[PDB]
Write a protein that binds this ligand. Structure first.
Ligand SMILES: NCCOB(c1ccccc1)c1ccc(Br)cc1
Ligand SMILES: NCCOB(c1ccccc1)c1ccc(Br)cc1
Ligand SMILES: CC1NC(=O)NC1CCCCCC(=O)O
Ligand SMILES: CC1NC(=O)NC1CCCCCC(=O)O
Lengths: 600, 600
């Protein structure tokens, strides 16, 4: 409490030691006449450590003081090898600070003194974290690549800088360039670093994987870096011919398609929470891949599953609507005359005239629940499919209904009634794709699990304020004639119904309503309308020109997400691999997709 | 009746004396040959006063007539010291008019004659009022600073102009520059006036406070002058280091943070009615201040108070829903058989089986009401918190319910029922902040106390037009079967319900409705819908792209308003002062907030 306070304090605690130490003060202010007055006559603490474990050279490198830095290296040339010792800066040398500041005349003078070109900077402030406004890696070659100083990147390779060197997160200098803001300038820097590769077709830096199993080409897709994704595609696409305006290009489709297994660029985009990566399946090598994946194979099998699931649910309801006998067969209708229960229990089973059709019906319904369960027990909380967490709980309710059966509980209706709504309402998950009702279900997915829960807690109040009042108002009145609030639980249910203007509202003209109801309900009506108009106006805002493109981009996104998931579960005798393979014609040996386009 | 007419008349009355007086006429028209024909042979009234107490030189200065002004000062050099004598222009000299017109060759010639550089212009038209299209102050140095003529500002200081001089409103020349339209040019003029300061660290013009206790840096925040607020920040922020793109700057945070007490820039912004100052807490020294004020300390304590207030209200309703016995215990059900009252009165108290839980419940509810009262009797009508004027009236209803108790009035329900709605609906004031339901409650705050009262008086009509009709229509009919309007008060209540389409509307098919109801209700339905559609379309307009930013700016504004108010009421053992202090490291001695940023 807190980490931000510590660095805020230690930045202030550093300036304290700078101001206190006359050596570090002159190194900060570039006082050449004061450094020699401290190092030569008399001899002071030349290896003086500051608050952050810094040296006088580390301070002289933070503020571009070349004159004050040459003084410290001509009087004591061992300060160059010294790294920062504090935890915030563990591993940083004076070369890192000069590279970050793009001090060319200092880096070219630091490498003449013999500085290390492989000094990791494992400090807590050099880590890949949101609280760090940057992430340039750990090696000084990566720092030169991130600042964009091409004069320093090649000047480091001149003195044995290794481009293959990875950091603590297994990232090469190519992986770090992908996570940078200046995308258009990093492409030129990405090519500058590729030229120093070994040059052989095997063991290439573009193939050196991240420690999370992610080549630089594959990392660009997950990160949503379109400028780098398009640039990394030039290395892996072959133009077949140029027939005037037409140009049929052949795409590599190696690391773009599965499998794999999870080492597939498509599976990484459909499973990530990055809102930027959703634009990658709209790129011209991939958009042709998934569009052909859905026109054939994709759309039919999804409709078959829906046609199967439509007939599967309509069979389950056929068992419910034809639920077993019988009437209440009990004098239970005498206690609490408000009871109209004719509870149907078992058994009373089977001895089947037309009842054996319901036996095979209950059998078909229960074998589908375990089939769903068997295919949905995966060894969670994701966008691309928020409806089929309900399909695994539907199979849970069927089993409970099966356990509610064979026990014959008076609560036989509650579990058998829950599966009716979850089963059907899950069929509009098949509206996804299909047609233009797909993005409409995207609207319902975005509201049910976001704008609802927040606005409910707003609408959860007010009601119980007026419901508690209406209870007190009509706790005094006789609930026989006009008793919308006879007890407290129904007082809230009747008030909730009245918030949505369903019931006519308590209206009785034979009797006289209490003096407080006619006053309390008028206010509840005006607030319930204003609270509902503001709910409709709050819908606006997610109606601009971009949100119609957003949900349409989200629709086709979750359609591609459904397409990739079907291919990774269905067998291989159906659904062939998209593209053509290169085996005599031996121009592979991988699978290629041929796409021609016309430049206007 | 009116003040605008007076100056309109006295401007016309002035031109009368100009046209009538041949001296003032020639001074207006720059008739050099006519001034000498009036002053030298013969000698006329050279000190002639006009309608506005002006002189011939005052008229010759209004219209840039240097040739006609030198005539009046070479023949009578005492007219320079003469000020305007009218009430509209009390205190204005011929130097003020030359400075306003930026007459450099006249001001440099007026100071050779020996004009006063400290002549206040206390006229009614020089005051800081909305009816005055400008406000340049009272001293001629301030006039030079407002017109932007740098050649005149320094030319006045050359002749002993005091920059420390304040006006009637305690404003320095620096305070007046903040209240100017040309913000981008006043910054250069603000620096020109700082250079003539004493130069010592103590008794500085930037510290000279307004007569309302407001330094020029603090006045810029309340006024919403962002260009000056950013410019005045350069004098009070220290850059710690520059590490390539990163640059951790240290902000002064002296006059920005409390306390104080009310001498705090944050407390001035959250309490002002200026729509412009709301943009100040979005500035880079302040936005980091309040964001860290709400991430920790702010948001938890506000949720604790809400969690306390949620449990406090749910306890109060537990006492209401379990209100005391008993039935009506009276033959009062015989008079007016429309009565279903079973009025519950006391006492009938206590002798507690499970009733002692309601005794401590009523005790917890009453001690919270006075606690609210004790902390809300402040020795009003503001935006940043329109819901908790209801929390002080809630505590008023609890006490009245306590006074309604111990008296056992038949109106026991009315005060006990009012506290149920005000207590709960005040909990959605805690929706402010929290999440995205905060700006939604901003919508409800902006509608309940603005668009409602105006539109109600529109919807207040029509209803009583049709309600009075429907009463007359069914004053003839028998209210037993279909009696929505049996008496006049319920005739308005039933018509109001029908305006919101709650009741089914009077529909009886066993009997025949009067020939006028079927005609009158059809018109009422069409108008009630058009009058409601136009109410929904009137919501649009406050739905553009800017109003979603407005209410979102208003949301975070009232969140900062809630954050500052909590800090100024909660003790000091919790909630530490935001930032770090400068006491060894002795670089203060005030509190500083360290903020680093990255320039792309
Ligand atoms: N059954 C689990 C979720 O359902 B689905 C789903 C899978 C196949 C066919 C239809 C729907 C899903 C949605 C998004 C992603 Br990404 C992955 C799967
Ligand atoms: N209780 C009086 C008003 O309530 B509030 C309020 C104060 C503390 C916690 C929650 C709400 C308020 C709102 C805006 C301003 Br600005 C100042 C106070
Ligand atoms: C203490 C330090 N001394 C120095 O020469 N640089 C310091 C820190 C530099 C800022 C790096 C912060 C970041 O990258 O997040
Ligand atoms: C009567 C006057 N004679 C004159 O030379 N100026 C007059 C008035 C000037 C206008 C100032 C109005 C204002 O500042 O609001």
């Amino acid at each position: 409490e807190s980490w931000a306070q510590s660095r805020d304090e230690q930045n202030l605690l550093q300036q304290k030691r700078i101001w206190e130490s006359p050596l570090l003060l002159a190194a900060k202010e570039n006082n050449v006449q004061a450094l020699y007055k401290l190092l030569k006559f008399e001899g002071c603490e030349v290896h003086q450590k500051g608050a952050m474990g810094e040296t006088a050279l580390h301070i002289a490198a933070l503020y571009d003081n070349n004159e004050a830095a040459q003084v410290l290296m001509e009087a004591a040339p061992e300060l160059v090898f010294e790294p920062m010792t504090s935890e915030l800066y563990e591993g940083q040398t004076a070369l890192h600070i000069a590279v970050i500041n793009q001090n060319v005349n200092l880096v070219r003078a630091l490498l003449a003194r013999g500085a290390s070109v492989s000094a990791r900077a494992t400090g807590s402030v050099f880590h890949y974290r949101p609280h760090n406004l940057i992430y340039y890696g750990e090696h000084p070659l990566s720092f030169a690549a991130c600042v964009g100083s091409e004069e320093i990147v090649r000047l480091l390779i001149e003195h044995g800088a290794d481009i293959r060197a990875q950091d603590s997160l297994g990232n090469t200098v190519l992986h770090i360039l992908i996570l940078q803001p200046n995308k258009t300038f990093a492409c030129q820097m990405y090519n500058l670093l590729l030229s120093y590769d070994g040059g052989d077709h095997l063991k290439s830096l573009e193939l050196v994987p991240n420690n999370q199993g992610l080549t630089p080409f594959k990392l660009a897709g997950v990160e949503g870096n379109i400028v780098m994704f398009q640039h990394l595609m030039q290395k892996r696409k072959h133009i077949q011919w140029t027939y005037g305006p037409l140009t049929s290009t052949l795409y590599d489709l190696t690391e773009i398609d599965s499998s794999g297994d999870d080492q597939s660029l498509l599976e990484l985009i459909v499973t990530t929470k990055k809102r930027e990566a959703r634009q990658i399946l709209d790129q011209t090598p991939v958009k042709e891949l998934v569009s052909l994946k859905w026109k054939r194979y994709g759309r039919p099998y999804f409709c078959v599953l829906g046609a199967i699931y439509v007939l599967y649910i309509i069979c389950f309801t056929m068992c419910c609507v034809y639920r077993p006998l019988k009437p209440r067969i009990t004098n239970r209708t005498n206690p609490r005359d408000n009871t109209l229960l004719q509870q149907k229990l078992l058994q009373e089973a089977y001895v089947t005239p037309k009842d054996d059709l319901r036996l095979v019906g209950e059998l078909v319904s229960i074998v589908g629940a375990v089939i769903i369960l068997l295919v949905e027990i995966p060894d969670q909380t994701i966008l691309g499919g928020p409806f089929h967490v309900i399909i695994v709980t539907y199979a849970f309710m069927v089993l409970v209904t099966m356990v509610m059966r064979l026990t014959n509980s008076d609560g036989e209706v509650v579990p058998m009634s829950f599966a009716l709504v979850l089963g059907w309402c899950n069929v509009m998950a098949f509206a996804r794709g299909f047609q233009m009702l797909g993005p409409f279900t995207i609207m319902i997915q975005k509201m049910i699990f976001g704008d609802l829960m927040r606005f409910c807690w707003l609408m959860a109040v007010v009601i119980l304020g007026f419901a508690s009042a209406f209870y007190i108002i009509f706790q005094t009145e006789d609930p026989d004639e006009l008793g919308h609030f006879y007890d407290y639980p129904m007082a809230l249910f009747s008030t909730f119904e009245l918030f949505l203007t369903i019931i006519d509202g308590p209206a009785n003209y034979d009797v006289d309503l209490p003096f407080m109801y006619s006053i309390t309900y008028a206010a509840f009506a005006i607030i319930a309308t204003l609270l509902m108009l503001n709910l409709l106006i709050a819908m606006m805002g997610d109606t601009h020109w971009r949100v119609a493109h957003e949900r349409d981009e989200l629709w086709r996104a979750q359609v591609v997400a459904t397409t990739v998931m079907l291919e990774r579960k269905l067998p291989r005798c159906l659904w062939p691999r998209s593209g053509i393979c290169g085996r005599e014609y031996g121009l592979g040996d991988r699978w290629f997709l041929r796409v021609e386009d016309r430049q206007d």
